[PDB]
């Protein structure tokens, strides 16, 4: 499904990218945070955790994750925690490994965000 959209549709891919740039900025701007590059600013897991709370209606206590991760291990933990929250929200377990997001596999970064946009379309 999403494989064809990434690999075999460049024109549509960029209609979805700008969408996702608007989508995540719609929510993170409420925290005075801006997302200018889809492919590198989600890698440490922080904005994914913050996004999940903005999208499912909770705050995540700052002692529950690494607000400023100082290691590859901490970013992997953040991303894994974000995937857990995704699963608590009704999504099935994401297909990419948490390390794939931390390593900027764009097909993985976009797939996670695509499934977030798809699910939380009507959320304001």
């Amino acid at each position: 499904a999403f494989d064809t959209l990434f690999d075999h549709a460049p024109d549509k891919l960029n209609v979805v990218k700008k969408t996702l740039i608007t989508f995540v900025n719609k929510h993170l701007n409420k925290l005075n945070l801006e997302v200018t590059e889809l492919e590198t600013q989600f890698a440490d897991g922080v904005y994914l955790v913050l996004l999940m709370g903005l999208l499912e209606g909770y705050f995540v206590p700052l002692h529950s994750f690494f607000l400023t991760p100082d290691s590859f291990e901490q970013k992997v933990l953040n991303v894994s925690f974000a995937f857990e929250l995704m699963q608590d929200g009704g999504l099935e377990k994401p297909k990419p490994r948490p390390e794939d997001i931390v390593n900027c596999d764009l097909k993985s970064t976009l797939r996670v965000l695509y499934n977030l946009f798809t699910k939380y379309r009507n959320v304001e």
Binding site: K30, L31, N32, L50, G53, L54, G57, Y58, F59, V60, P61, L62, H63, S64, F65, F81, L85, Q87, D88
Partner: protein
């Protein structure tokens, strides 16, 4: 020996469902001649460890010795119950939140609001004498119930278990700035609870939900990191203003204890 087997889930009469949410569901029901609510906790990755923990954590909520504390009547262990479940007596007016913000029939007057404050302060003073404190007990208007005679009672069935939604906060507007950021073990829990009471005072004064226009994530992040606070309400009595301000001191060490403010609130009732 196994001290307590708990309540038999099979003995519960589920009458009508009141809620379904992140924790599970809540029903109105009956059990052994009692009108009750039944809180069904639906926990992902249930394990024998978590079930053991539930059965050790539940007895601490069975507090029958203070009028402003609403005990958990008992709990259903899982196994053999389908889910970890707890029961509490049905409170006809629902939560303080319901009474203040969702009251379609009457508006409670400010003498009743002062009595609610006194009730909550008395119950919190009692809970603060427990050794150790009940873990993961947050004070907010959704976690206080209003009984048939309008007595406010701290809801022990709203204390979060160790396995229950860890890492998520659905009522951050009542939480002390330090408690939004630091592990409970690195905070003075009693002082953090007094901040929650200060927000309750604000709620009783304004009859508004604190930060109602903001999402929970916005609330927690802006209170923790950007100094966001409720605005003192205009033109209230100096005595109420001073009490609100000292209970909401930015310095946790300078906030009063509940047993200190109980006599202040007593003198605030009617002669």
């Amino acid at each position: 020996m196994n001290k307590h087997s708990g309540i038999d889930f099979k003995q519960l009469n589920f009458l009508t469902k009141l809620n379904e949410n992140h924790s599970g569901e809540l029903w109105k029901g009956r059990w052994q001649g009692n009108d009750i609510v039944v809180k069904v906790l639906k926990v992902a990755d249930w394990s024998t460890r978590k079930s053991r923990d539930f059965n050790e954590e539940c007895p601490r909520l069975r507090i029958f010795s203070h009028p402003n504390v609403l005990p958990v009547l008992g709990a259903c262990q899982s196994p053999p119950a389908p889910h970890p479940t707890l029961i509490t007596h049905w409170m006809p007016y629902g939560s303080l939140y319901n009474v203040l913000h969702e009251g379609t029939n009457f508006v409670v007057d400010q003498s009743q609001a002062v009595k609610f404050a006194l009730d909550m302060a008395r119950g919190m003073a009692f809970l603060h004498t427990l050794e150790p404190l009940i873990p993961r007990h947050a004070l907010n208007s959704r976690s206080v119930m209003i009984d048939e005679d309008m007595t406010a009672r701290i809801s022990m069935a709203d204390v979060k278990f160790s396995f229950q939604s860890p890492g998520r906060m659905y009522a951050p507007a009542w939480v002390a700035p330090e408690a939004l950021q630091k592990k409970p073990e690195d905070t003075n829990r009693r002082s953090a609870d007094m901040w929650s009471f200060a927000v309750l005072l604000w709620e009783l004064v304004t009859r508004e939900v604190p930060f109602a226009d903001l999402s929970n994530m916005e609330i927690g992040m802006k209170v923790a990191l950007e100094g966001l606070r409720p605005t003192i309400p205009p033109g209230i009595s100096p005595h109420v203003s001073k009490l609100m301000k000292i209970c909401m001191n930015e310095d946790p060490a300078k906030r009063p204890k509940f047993d200190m403010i109980v006599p202040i609130l007593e003198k605030m009732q009617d002669k």
